[PDB]
Structure formats: C-alpha cells, structure tokens
Design a binder for these strands. Structure first.
Lengths: 119, 54, 206, 115, 122
RNA sequence: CCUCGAUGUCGGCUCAUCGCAUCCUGGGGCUGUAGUCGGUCCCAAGGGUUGGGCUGUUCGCCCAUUAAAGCGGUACGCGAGCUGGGUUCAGAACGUCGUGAGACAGUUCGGUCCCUAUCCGUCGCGGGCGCAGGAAAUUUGAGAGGAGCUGUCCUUAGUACGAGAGGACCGGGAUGGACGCACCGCUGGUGUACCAGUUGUUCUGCCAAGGGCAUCGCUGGGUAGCUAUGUGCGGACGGGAUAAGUGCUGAAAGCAUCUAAGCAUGAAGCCCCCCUCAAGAUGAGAUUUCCCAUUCCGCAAGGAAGUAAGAUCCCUGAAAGAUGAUCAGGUUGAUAGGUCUGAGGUGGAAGUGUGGCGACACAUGGAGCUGACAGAUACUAAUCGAUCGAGGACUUAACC
RNA sequence: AAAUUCCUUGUCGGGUAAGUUCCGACCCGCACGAAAGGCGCAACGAUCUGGGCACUGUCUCAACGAGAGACUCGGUGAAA
C-alpha cells in the first residue's frame, strides 16, 4: 500500500509536489521519517521521467513539479534544473537515486527526523 | 462507568508495574567520544557508516 | 493414507474433457524428504515426519542441521508429521513425490487460514445488526449478554476479537491434474490460506 | 507464478480465434445437445465486454431478439464454441459498451469503420 | 433473483399483464428463485380481454430474469427484463402461445410444452 | 416479608440459554390399523421450528408456504445494549358527571430515554516465572469446544393390499432447502496517489498542452485488496454400550412365565469414529538433534563473571497486525523501494502531416499512461556494534 | 359506531393475496344536535389519517472506500 500521512488526498498531492520540487531545488531536505520514505519513490519517478528527455516526459514532469525558481541570476526553474543537470549527472546509474539517513527525534513531537539527499 | 470502590495502593502499584520505559538501544560511535542510537547519525560526530554528513 | 505437503501458488480454470469448467487451485509440491520415523516401540504411536523446501545455511542453525543430518539431503523449512500409514514402504531419507497421487482420488486439504485482524461481531460471527434508521442507535454491535439472574455472562458468548490465522481442513476435494516434472497438483475447488502459505494434502477419510 | 500459470495454460488455450475488440458485431456458433444430438445454433450480436486474461478471459455479446435484449457471456478460450466469424467492425470509444442496455432501437447505432 | 414482492412481466397471451410474487416455492423459507422454479403470484394488472382478471392468486413459472443463469459449461445467460408464464395446477401453461425468448434451463425440467411454444430458445 | 437517601413498566429489535408436560424428524406398543394416510400411549430435548396484511400490541383472525410453523422459565430474560408506538407530567378537544375548580382501567392530536467501565464476568493478545542444565524443532493426549436438520423425484412396482378409487414397508440412485466453513478462477460490488471524457472560474506571459477549487466537481470503466448475492466443500458409510419395545431358555409356583441365574436384539439419543483448541494436565508428558562440565573466592553451604548451542536490542518489510506478537530478511543478499521486461485496466497520448471555412476526422500507433500484481537486476536502505544466555541433591537394578 | 359507540374488530360493500386503521351505506345515538352553535364548503396548513405513481441500503443481507475520534509514540493533564 501507500501511506496516507494523516491528511486528505488533495493535501497529500500538494505536499508531495512541494516536497519533490524543494528537493530538486535544495539537493538535501530534512523531513520526518515517513514523509522521507514516501518522498523517495516519487522523486525517483520524476528523475527517471527527466532522464528520457523528450517533450512528452517534459510535459508530464511540468504537470507534476511546482514552478519554483531553482537558481539565482540564471533564471533556471526547477524543471530545467531537473532535466539538464540531473539527467547530465545521472545517465550512468539506474535506480536508487536517494538516500535516507535517520536523525534523532523531534523535541516537540518525538517524531523521528530524517535526511533526504540525492546520490 | 463509575468506580464502585477505590483502588488500593497495592493494586495501583501492581497496575503500574508495566509502565516503565526501556533503555534506548544504544551503540558506541565509531568516530568515538559519544554514544549513539543504532542506525542513526551521531549528533556530535555527524558521521554514519564513516565520513561526514554535511 | 498417502500425503504430501506443499504451498499454494494460486488459482486457474481448467476445462475438463468437455465444455465444462473446473475451478482449480495450483499447489506446488517439491519432493518431500522423510526425516524421521516415529515408531510405537519408543514413541507409542505410528507417524512419519515429512520435510519440505530448503533453507540457507545462514537461516538454519545447528539443531536442524543435525536432525536432518541423520539422513541428509539438505536442511528443510517445513517439517510436519503424519500418522496412520504403513511403515515398511516408507524409509528414512526417502523422497515422496506428487507421482504417488493420481488424477482421480479424493483429498482432505489442510492449511492455516488468511488473517483478518481485530475485526468485530458482525463480520466475525455472521450475526445480524439492528436498524440503520427509525432512530435506532444500535447497529454493528454484538448483542445483549444474557439474562440477569445468573449475575454474570455465560461462558462462550461470541464477541469481537481476532479472526483468522487458524488451521482448517476442507474435505472431499478432488484431484484434477497432476504434473510430474513441474511438481504440481491441481485440485478442484478452493483451499484455505493466503498465497505461498503451507498446505498439507492427505487422502481423505471416507 | 505468472510464467508458471502461463506454462500450464499454454497447452489448452485455443489458438484459432480472430482478433475482435469489444464493440463490434460478431456471430457465435455454439454447439448444443438437445436430443443427444450434435447441432450448432447461431448467436449474432455486438461484443459488449471482453475481460480477463489467459483461460480466465471472458467475453459477452448482446442480441435483441423479439423485443427483448439477450446478453450471452462465454469464456473466450472454450471448445464448445465451434467457430467465430466477425461480419462488421465497429467504431467505439469506450472499452465496455454498457450503455447499450439502456439504449435500444437504432439509437444504438454502431458506426462501421471498415477495418 | 426474484423475491417476495416483485412485479414481473407476463410472457404469454393469458390476459395477465403484470404479476406480484407472494412466496417462492421451495424449502421452509426461501430467499430467492433464480430461474425455472415456480412462484405464487397475484395478477396486479390485467389485459381487458382474457381468461384471468385482476387480482386472483395463480402459480407461475419464471421464464427469464435480469440476473441470468450460469450453465454447467461456465457460460452465462442474462436477459434484459424479468418475465414469467402462468401455469395451472399442472406442468403446462394455460396461455395459447408465448411471447419473447425463453431460457434453456426450462428444458432440463419437464417443461416441454413451454419450450416448444417458445419462438426462440437461448 | 426485602426495596419509596429510587429495584425503570407493555410490545418490538440484537443475543441467546435451559426444562420436557414433544410441533417435526428417530425408535415402538394398541386400534373400531384394508397401504402413505390416521387417533391414543411409551422412550426420546440431538438438531430444526417461515414470510406477510390489520392493531401500540403480546393475543388473535386472515393469505400463501412448511416436514413442523411447540408450550414455558431466566426481574411476565435482556432499556449503565437500542427504539418509544400505547401507557403514567405540563397543551388542546369530544361524550359524560359536577352549581363550580375539575374528574373518567372512555377516546383523540402533540410530548428532552443521562453516564469517559474501577472490580468480578466474557471475547482476543502480550510480558514474567515455573517444569533438580541451557536451547532448536516434532508430537502423545487427560480434558474442552464445534458439528450434529430435512424435503422432492426416479427405480424397486401400479407390486403387496384392495371388484375399483387409491397405494405401500424395507432397499438403491440423483438432486434441492436452510445453516456452517473456506477462497476470488468465474458472475458482480467497492476500489478518494489507475485511465479517459467534460462544465464553470483561476493560474503556468500568449496558442497548443497542463495544474488548483467546485462531495473524488460530475460522468464512463477499473489493478491489488476486502467482499456475496459468486465458487468449492460439509453434516456420510460405520463401531461399542443402552432407553422404550421384541425376545430365547427357565424354576420359584411339576403348568405357564422376557426372570430371580444365564443369553440376545433394539433409537436423530450416550461414548468413539469427523474438525478445531489443548502440558500452567504444577499429575508441568514423550521422541530427535546441539553445547556440555571453564575462570576467582569462605578452601568446600554457595556466590560472581566472561562464554558455547541459541535467541534478542536495532533496521528493511508483510502472506501478519490496535500496540506488543507471528512470519519473510539483515551485505556469500532478493526483505522493501527504484530501473528494465511483462500480465491486467483504460482505451488510440503529445508533436508533426493531410482533408475541411470551422467545430472536427484520419496517419504516425492495440499508441501513451499505469497504486498496491510476478520475474530479473547489488543501483539506494536493512551499517558498525552491544545485551541476555548452561556447569547440576538421597535410595535401588547395573556398570567406570 | 363520529375527535363522541363500552357490547365492538356492530353489519353489508369498495380497496388488499390477506385490511382491529380508511372510505361508502343502515341506525339499539350506553352518552350527537342547532350561536359550549348544526350541517356543508372553493382556496389555504412544517396539522392528523388512508391509498398510488416515481424513487431509493428503510429492508431482504450486508460489502467496500474517505475523513474526525478510538489504537502507538512525544507534551500538558481533569472529573463524577
């Protein structure tokens, strides 16, 4: 199955889209353990969608990724950064683009923190 | 829905006998000096299976 | 009373020499190895342990390794004995195959059921619930406990709890197809258990 | 287990059927035994659904006979159908033409495509 | 599946137009009569000319149903609308002829005079 | 006589449990029993004992079934389980009584059913310890529970019997009804990270292509899973001891007599045979395999302290699950996610081209897309570690 | 036989497979009756009562899915 993360379907789609585009931006992300575990599969789907490079995959990735600015003074969006730099880094691999590293639990929640990194 | 009689201190302590919390599963860090949970990044060292995490 | 034990692969649908259809469970049964023969001179009964599947050396500890290594092919995953057989044809270290069954005989099929978790009164015991409407706030609920006068509820009032996970035998199942080289039995009907679970197969007590 | 189920079913799944999609008309010669006789009777209808896979694949047809629609469902890969002919292909957009139960009498116009 | 309190089409020229089931014949209490079995039904609506008028209690046989039947072959019959044929205290119908198609499952019971009177059997 | 410092009434729903003074089924006596039919009585409580109309109704009357539509007890069972229709508050009215305020086991329309479960109880799941070592498996079964009901047709045969009508006992064969257990291959249902169409507005600078919100916006299908109305199977053939009954031999009491002595037969009933749970069955069972007898002290009653066999802490998960637990795995590895190959499901993507004024249609092309489905792949995550864990009394038979 | 009728489910008829409620008719009116008004009456009513067409999980008979509690963890922490 897939985890529901205690929120409705539209909230889950919006939160996963914001998280996958912020991972494309920042190249490392601190989230809770299960947000990390559900983010891993979707970010790898986006990366293998961008590795094809054709315009149909471009329009699918533009349907999924938020329109957030990815670099200063270059006008590079998250979609263009994903396609160009991520595919350019990642022709050689196949599968397994993400790392999950556990951290100590949250002070106010006791929620187990986690780090998503992209190698 | 109402307690008929008060629970005595003996029954109170016998119910509370399972209310402990266990020690966290802990491991000495390979980068040494501090003590860590298993499968977690050490907070002082910032290391996990060798090397830095920055 | 012949018997083997394998695992449940799934379901197929087999035409039987006519336009008519047979619902079929497909049971993979690899050659079962006899491990040990319980005899009444030192055990008080007559039985035989059949073993099935092969575990790795990391999975198998030393007591299973020795107990197999009395007469050794390999350490086995499912070890289960069966009673009420002749003993002279069965020997220790002998392999029994699906070829000892034919496509006509009548089978008791025993397996551990699927799990349904903590699931309550109406789903568990097949009992009815009260009205959804006319103002009744009583539905999906167990019942009344019983009469007032005994000043308790009687033993065995059926309540919510955990369903499934129990061993159940279906009776008089009929073999449709036996496949030698692919190690299959194909049984008319439906057998208890989830996929890839252990099911043992016996000649039915008619 | 999909390859093993394919290997078991591969010997007895039939091979001589024509490739018909749901939503085109067709005729089925089914053999029926009335008097311990071997006769075949004919069923001309439009294929409403085709579902399932392997031997488990079934298909149904619908024929309006004498003011009453009759919908007949066969398993596809069966020996009791002698032969299946397609007479007119159709142009449909759905995969399952469930609206032909409600529609009746040449509002149910399956447009031919000649392919 | 035909219950108590179902209205059915009447498939013959017996003068009945619609029937209402009372009790399905079978065991002690029976939930359903799928096809072929006899039911006890009352004529709720009637043809103005005919041998039976509105509101008497007859025994009918179910001919065709919306939820169809399963053959032993694995094939399936499913008609469009529920319909029945009135018989009288014996195995034969009192209607002169039958309209509409009739299922094959009447033939395995001794319903020869209905399944011969049918204009097409499926 | 207990209860008025509160013991909630009738009926219905949900759940049943018992008695037998038996409604059916089983086994029989007697008959004013020509044969299924019947009536009474005996044994028998194992199971079963239907839907509707009217009434607040139990109770009745009626229609249509059934093999049968039992009578009762459990606070006229069950309201810290539900409903509130009538009763038994305040409003109003009719008949009647009263001079009146008002009153009717006379009627009629409307009328707040509170509670977070402490202890027993019951249904499920765990931790601890025990069983003169420490474990891994496999079981014997004392003892519990569950199941236990029946019809229709054909043949035996229109045969026995009965001028006729009618119509068998016993015995075989097929099949159904209601319950029960299991499982999604089929029929379907659902299937809120699957696919497609489409309305309104708004956003991605515009076209084309998409996103947000409108119950998942609505509509048409639907993978895994759960599911019944769907499919498979069940209660069978049997064994022992009996109940009522039928007896054999046989005196008491030269006869007779089922009787005291002996000997048989005989029920859906009892105990097994069927299925499940079950060594805490402290009466702690048995079999097979592994580690086995090491360090210090008071020198020895015995302590403590590293270990072997083995599990565990922690991590990847589901065929399991409220959490614990059980099960699949932990780098000589396929446990999960990815990637690739597929099955299924939607159904003909975007972009270009051609036809047309255009909405649109064709070709590229069974295309594109695809959540839980099954194979391959060491690409990422199951890393490094730590913890718990044996050394064994008196008597007999018999050996170092 | 009524907001009034205990005998009472008065009797006959319509409706229904079946109708103690409903409607129509008779009148033995326990105990209607003429401004405590009698008998009618179009429109009107979140009134009361009986029936029918559509429609449906109200039901036969339950099944799945979503959210908030419930359940596990971290914080604070009552009551009868």
């Amino acid at each position: 199955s897939y985890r529901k993360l205690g929120r409705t379907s539209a909230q889950r789609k919006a939160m996963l889209r914001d998280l996958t585009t912020d991972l494309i931006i920042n190249e490392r992300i601190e989230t809770t353990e299960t947000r990390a575990k559900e983010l891993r599969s979707v970010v790898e789907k986006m990366i293998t969608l961008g590795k094809r490079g054709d315009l149909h995959a471009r329009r699918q990735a533009a349907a999924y990724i938020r329109n957030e600015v990815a670099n200063e003074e270059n006008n590079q969006d998250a979609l263009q950064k994903l396609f160009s730099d991520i595919a350019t880094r990642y022709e050689e691999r196949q599968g397994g683009y993400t790392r999950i590293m556990k951290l100590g639990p949250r002070r106010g929640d006791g929620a187990p923190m986690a780090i998503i990194e992209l190698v | 829905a109402v307690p008929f009689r008060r629970t005595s201190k003996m029954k109170k302590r016998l119910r509370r006998t399972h209310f402990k919390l266990n020690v966290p599963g802990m491991t000495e860090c390979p980068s040494c000096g501090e003590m860590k949970l298993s499968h977690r990044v050490c907070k002082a060292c910032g290391s996990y299976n060798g090397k830095d995490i920055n | 009373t012949k018997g083997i034990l394998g695992r449940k692969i799934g379901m197929t649908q087999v035409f039987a020499e006519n336009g008519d259809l047979i619902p079929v469970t497909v049971i993979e049964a690899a050659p079962n190895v006899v491990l040990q023969k319980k005899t009444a001179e030192n055990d008080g009964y007559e039985a035989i342990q059949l073993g099935f599947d092969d575990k790795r050396e990391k999975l198998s500890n030393k007591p299973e390794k020795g107990h197999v290594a009395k007469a050794e092919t390999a350490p086995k995953r499912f070890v289960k004995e069966l009673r009420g057989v002749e003993m002279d044809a069965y020997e220790v270290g002998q392999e029994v195959k699906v070829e000892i069954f034919s496509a006509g005989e009548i089978v008791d099929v025993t397996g551990v059921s699927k799990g349904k978790g903590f699931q309550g009164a109406i789903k568990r015991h097949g009992q009815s619930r009260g009205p959804m409407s006319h103002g009744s706030r009583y539905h999906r609920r167990p019942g009344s406990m019983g009469p007032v006068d005994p000043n308790r509820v009687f033993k065995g009032k059926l309540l919510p709890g955990r369903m499934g996970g129990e061993q159940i035998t279906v009776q008089n199942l009929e073999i449709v197809k036996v496949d030698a080289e692919r190690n299959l039995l194909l049984i008319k009907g439906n057998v208890p258990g989830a996929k890839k679970s252990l099911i043992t197969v016996k000649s039915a007590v008619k | 287990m999909q390859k093993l189920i394919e290997d078991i079913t591969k010997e007895q799944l039939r091979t001589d059927l024509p490739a018909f999609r749901p939503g085109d008309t067709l005729r089925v010669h089914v053999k029926v035994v009335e008097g311990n006789r071997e006769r075949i009777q004919i069923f001309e209808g439009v294929v409403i659904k085709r579902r399932g896979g392997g031997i488990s694949e079934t298909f149904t047809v619908r024929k309006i006979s004498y003011g009453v629609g009759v919908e007949r469902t066969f398993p596809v890969h069966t020996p009791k159908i002698a032969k299946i002919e397609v007479v007119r292909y159709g142009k449909v957009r759905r995969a399952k033409l469930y609206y032909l139960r409600e529609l009746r009498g040449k509002a149910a116009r399956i447009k031919e495509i000649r392919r | 599946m035909i219950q108590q309190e179902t209205r059915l089409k009447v498939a013959d020229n017996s003068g009945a137009r619609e029937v209402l089931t009372i009790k399905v014949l079978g065991g002690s209490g029976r939930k359903t009569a799928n096809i072929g079995d006899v039911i006890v039904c009352t004529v709720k609506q009637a043809t103005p000319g005919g041998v039976v008028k509105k509101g008497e209690v007859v025994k009918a046989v179910i001919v065709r149903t919306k939820s169809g039947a399963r053959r032993s072959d694995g094939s399936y019959i499913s008609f469009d609308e529920n319909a029945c044929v009135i018989i009288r205290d014996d195995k034969s119908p009192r209607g002169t002829r039958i309209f509409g198609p009739v299922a094959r499952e009447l033939r395995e019971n001794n319903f020869m005079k209905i399944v011969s009177l049918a204009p097409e059997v499926i």
